[PDB]
Amino acid sequence: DIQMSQSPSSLSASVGDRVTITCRASQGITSFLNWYQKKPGKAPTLLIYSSNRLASAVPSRFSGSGSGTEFTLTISSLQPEDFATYYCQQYISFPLTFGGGTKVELK
Amino acid sequence: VQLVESGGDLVKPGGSLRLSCVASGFTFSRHEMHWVRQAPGEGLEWLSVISETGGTTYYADSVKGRFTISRDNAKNSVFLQMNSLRAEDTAVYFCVRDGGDPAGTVRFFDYWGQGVLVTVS
Amino acid sequence: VQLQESGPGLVKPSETLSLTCAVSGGSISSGYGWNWIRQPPGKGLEWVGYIYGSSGSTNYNPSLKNRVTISKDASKNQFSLKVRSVTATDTAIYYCARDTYPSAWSWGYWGQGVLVTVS
Amino acid sequence: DIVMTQIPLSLPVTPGEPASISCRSSQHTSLDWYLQKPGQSPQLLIYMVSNRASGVPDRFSGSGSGTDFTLKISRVEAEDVGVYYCMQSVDFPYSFGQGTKVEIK
Amino acid sequence: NLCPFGEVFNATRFASVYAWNRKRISNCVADYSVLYNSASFSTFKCYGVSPTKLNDLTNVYADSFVIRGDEVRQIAPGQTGKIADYNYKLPDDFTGCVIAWNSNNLDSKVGGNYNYLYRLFRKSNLKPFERDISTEIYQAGSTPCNGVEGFNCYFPLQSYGFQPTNGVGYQPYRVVVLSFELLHAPATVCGP
Amino acid sequence: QSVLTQPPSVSGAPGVTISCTGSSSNIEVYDVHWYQQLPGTAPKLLIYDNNQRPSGISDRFSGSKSGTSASLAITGLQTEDEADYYCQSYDTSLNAYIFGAGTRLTV
Amino acid sequence: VQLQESGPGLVKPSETLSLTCAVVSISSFLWNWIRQPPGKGLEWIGEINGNSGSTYYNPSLKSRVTISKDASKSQFSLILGSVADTAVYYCATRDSGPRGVDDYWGQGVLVTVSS
Ligand SMILES: *[C@@H]1O[C@H](CO)[C@@H](O)[C@H](O)[C@H]1NC(C)=O
């Protein structure tokens, strides 16, 4: 199937900057990608769906974009409750294939 | 909305085990309820799917033939009857609720389960 | 098997022509799909109707608008064709038929035919 | 003729809770369900006893056999405002419903 | 001396459920445990005949129609629904098997794939093994409609509209129904 | 599109290829069936299910339907095959049985 | 494709009621007129056939009502006489087909009579 491959491995900077995260692909998934948010020790949570639309009760800090093969999640204004790992997920074709996980950490 | 797993144990390779994720907080017969796993030190990996009536399923390549996903819409629970448990099936097993109409161009995972740990040794 | 037509061959326009294909050797109440196919004397064949043997549900050609109707008289083992409000272009050679095998897409087992013209 | 009546004349529904509109007639069957958002033409959302129209969301669901039919609003989000009608087309005198104004809380 | 199973199980494009193919298979020596040993089919269940011991014991037909995924419950003896009442009803004494596999990478395209249809409304239920290809307008109860449609008169067919990313219950499963029928006749198809 | 199309007439000597090409709605989904009609007689089932000959037939007649185009080979014709040759598929657009235009064989 | 309607706007308490509905062919669909008084439900007043085969009317209002339509002018009209009144007027249909049910209706225009 389509192997989703995130970049980079990890990210860390000062709290309040504009951090970025991408999820490249191999075969075409025409703007479907979901982003999930997983904190260590609990269940993961849905962040945004269809690569643009935000989910229920997610605050307006995080925003996504992307089209075709190259996708991008924009951590716009970093709140201190967001140092976690993020998983990207495509659904144009079975079997569903998640990303490798990008770990963001507070400085 | 709440999803409570069960069936945590330790596995000698080859035994028979069955999980049960009881779902609550929503009408159950209108979503596809399924399973995503995560080995420790490894990223997440999709496992199975089952339809809104228990009519059909689709497994991944690694787990095809060994596992069996099921559901009973009166008992509001989804299962995973597992067989031929190899050494690499030591992970946490989440039960997930795709949110979206079954007929839509939108597939997304709304509410996860907490995930029960099953060790294969 | 055997299938023999009947009916008058000359009509005035805007009337109903009746053609009964009397069959023999096999009962009409079956899973077989019975047929009418007409042919204008110059151009060539064109399908006009269809009827399933057991239930009797009828399926027509939608180029003909609503004119045709097919009834199967089971006591005498024959089926009819009544195209109503005919014109000068519905003047053809009519062939009743039966499909090759059950629920096929074609047919052997024809009849001799009639030639109904309309003055 | 054939006349019907909805059982609630108007309905208060808090956001999130499910709703239910019933309909009880006099005598695959044609019965419709419309929506009049205020100031526009009606719009079809349940075209026979249990079917769905072209651009309807997945929330609505028609149901019911016999005479008592039901259009169940599953999750009343804060835009389903208006009235709901029953069209019986089993005879020549087509008759709409009485209407049921839904109320947000 | 073999069968054309490379044209039934591997056609490029199947037909709709309301107008289903049927290819009479004769003059064969057939190996039915070729597909049964493959096991790439989500459904393979032989009713009446003994499955996988049927490579030993007149003719067989081969239907071909692609339905949505949760509609494979109807392709069985004694079912009701929008397939086993109005599109394709199996008889009560069926002898054969239904083979269905999730053909999602083939039969669906981005946007809709409005080629495959079904028959939502029909005046009565099918006698077993009977097609209906008519497209006359279906009146519901009273008003006659001369080829026109509106209220109380509907177009009988309705598309599936296969999106590539629907749920697993709404996806094109290519169903092939083999009907084994022995008659008082010399056989032309048996197992080796 | 949505119509079968034969050549007008074919001919030869003892010692003929009739092709019925169809569109995307006619065939590649369904089956071509050849009929032969003697002049002033009822037509005869010649080829059904693209190559299967009925009970009682010659052997120089064979159908070969590959893709969206079929063919009827008559190699080394006899002088008693001078007749008409039609092709029957089923259409989905207009949703009726489609007969071909028509062709005839002349020695 | 949308349906637009037009009428006079003002009418005497003993005049006649007449308005049109400019529109796809007339011969395709069976066509229909419904109305809505203020503070009351919708009311079906009558329906015509597409090939001008027949007309059906609401039997309470079937005293001085007339629905006529053209075959080339893409026209569709109502003629109610001796004017329940003082309402808004809709012309409507229900499309069908492979891609679901469309059900195009019109915007509406209010005709104010004495009741
Ligand atoms: C169908 O295609 C598959 C894939 O090429 C092949 O393995 C199989 O032998 C073919 N025939 C049948 C009868 O499945």
C39 φ, ψ (degrees, to nearest 5): -145, 115
A 10 A CB-CB count for D71 gives: 27
d(CA B19, CA B29): 19
Q: The tokens of D30 are what?
A: 């044609």
Domain span at residue D80 reads 1-105
Ordered by where they begin, the domains of chain F are 10-102 (2.60.40.10)
Number of C-alpha atoms within 13 angstroms, CB side, residue A103?
8
Experimental method, per PDB record:
cryo-EM
Nearest atom within ligand 1 for CA of residue E10: 1
d(CA F35, CA D79): 63
Q: What's CA B78's distance to the chain center, in Å?
A: 7
Q: Identify which of E103, E110, E115 has the alpha carbon closest to the alpha carbon of residue E171.
A: E103
d(CA E177, CA E173): 12
Interacting residues of E83 by C-beta distance below 8 A, sequence separation 6+: E17, E67, E71, E74, E75, E118
Question: CA dihedral defined by A58, A59, A61, A67, rounded to 10 degrees?
Answer: 40
d(CA F68, CA F21): 6
d(CA A34, CA A50): 6
Q: Number of structural domains, chain D?
A: 1
A 10 A CB-CB count for B90 gives: 17
Interacting residues of E5 by C-beta distance below 8 A, sequence separation 6+: E30, E34, E35
DSSP letters of B52-85? TTS--B---STTTTTEEEEEETTTTEEEEEE-S-
d(CA G33, CA A89): 51
Domain assignments of chain A as residue spans, ordered by start: 5-94
d(CA A85, CA G1): 50
Greatest pairwise CA separation for chain D in angstroms:
40
Interacting residues of A96 by C-beta distance below 8 A, sequence separation 6+: A89, A90, B46
Strands E96-102 and E43-47: antiparallel
d(CA F71, CA F62): 8
- Which chain B residues touch A57 with a CB distance below 8 Å? none
d(CA B38, CA B35): 10
Residue with CA nearest ligand 1 atom 5: E10
d(CA G42, CA D83): 11
Nearest to F42 among C43, C61, C112 (CB): C112
- Find residue A46's DSSP bridge partners: A36
Q: The tokens of G47 are what?
A: 């329906």
Distance (Å) from the C-alpha of residue B62 to the closest C-alpha of chain A? 11
E110–A32: do the CB atoms touch at under 8 Å? Answer: no
Q: Report domain G4-111's class.
A: mainly beta
- Find residue D102's DSSP bridge partners: D11
d(CA B4, CA B111): 12
Q: The tokens of F101 are what?
A: 């235009």
Q: The tokens of D41 are what?
A: 């033409």
Q: Identify which of D93, E147, E148 has the alpha carbon closest to the alpha carbon of residue G56.
A: D93
d(CA C96, CA B82): 61
Q: Identify which of C77, C86, C112 has the alpha carbon closest to the alpha carbon of residue C6.
A: C112
For E29, E59, E94, E162, E182, the CA distances from E185, given in Å and listed in that order, are 17, 10, 19, 44, 8
G98–E146: do the CB atoms touch at under 8 Å? Answer: no
Q: Identify which of A85, A89, A84, A90 has the alpha carbon closest to the alpha carbon of residue A101.
A: A85
Q: The tokens of B38 are what?
A: 């995560």
d(CA A19, CA A94): 31
Q: Identify which of A15, A17, A23, A14 has the alpha carbon closest to the alpha carbon of residue A89.
A: A23
Nearest to D28 among E140, E143, E151 (CB): E140
E8 membership: H or E segment, kind and range? helix E5-8
DSSP letters of G27-74? TTB-EEEEEE-TTS--EEEEEE-TTS--EEE-TTTTTSEEEEE-SSS-
Domain assignments of chain E as residue spans, ordered by start: 1-111+164-192, 112-163
d(CA E83, CA E89): 7
**Partner D contacted by B101 (CB < 8 A):** yes
The answer for C 31-50 residues in CB contact with F (under 8 A) is: 43-47
8 Å CB contact between F20 and F10? no
Distance (Å) from the C-alpha of residue E180 to the closest C-alpha of chain D? 35
Is the peptide bond prior to F39 cis by the omega test (within 30 degrees of 0)?
Answer: no
d(CA B90, CA B82): 13
- Find residue B69's DSSP bridge partners: B80
A 10 A CB-CB count for E15 gives: 21
For E131, E149, E157, the CA distances from E137, given in Å and listed in that order, are 17, 7, 9
Which of E8, E61, E113, E115 best tests the F interface by mutation, with the highest count of F CBs <10 A?
E115
Q: Identify which of D13, D11, D18, D23 has the alpha carbon closest to the alpha carbon of residue D70.
A: D23
d(CA B18, CA B63): 15
Ordered by where they begin, the domains of chain B are 2-113 (2.60.40.10)
CA F65 – ligand 1 centroid, Å: 20
Mutate to test the pocket of ligand 1, among E38, E40, E101, E178 (most ligand atoms within 8 A of CB): E38
Burial B43-67 (b: 16+ CB within 10 A, else e): ebbbbbbbbbebebbbbbeebeeeb
Q: The tokens of B29 are what?
A: 């017969």
Sign of torsion over alpha carbons D18, D24, D28, D33:
negative
A 10 A CB-CB count for F15 gives: 6
Resolution (A): 3.4
For B10, B37, B40, B88, B118, the CA distances from B15, given in Å and listed in that order, are 10, 19, 21, 14, 12
Indicate if ligand 1 lies below 6 Å from the C-beta of E186. Answer: no
For the structural domain made of A5-94, what CATH number should be given? 2.60.40.10
Work out the burial of residue A18: count CB atoms within 10 Å of its CB; fewer than 13 is exposed, 13-18 middle, 19 or more buried.
exposed
Q: Report domain C2-100's class.
A: mainly beta
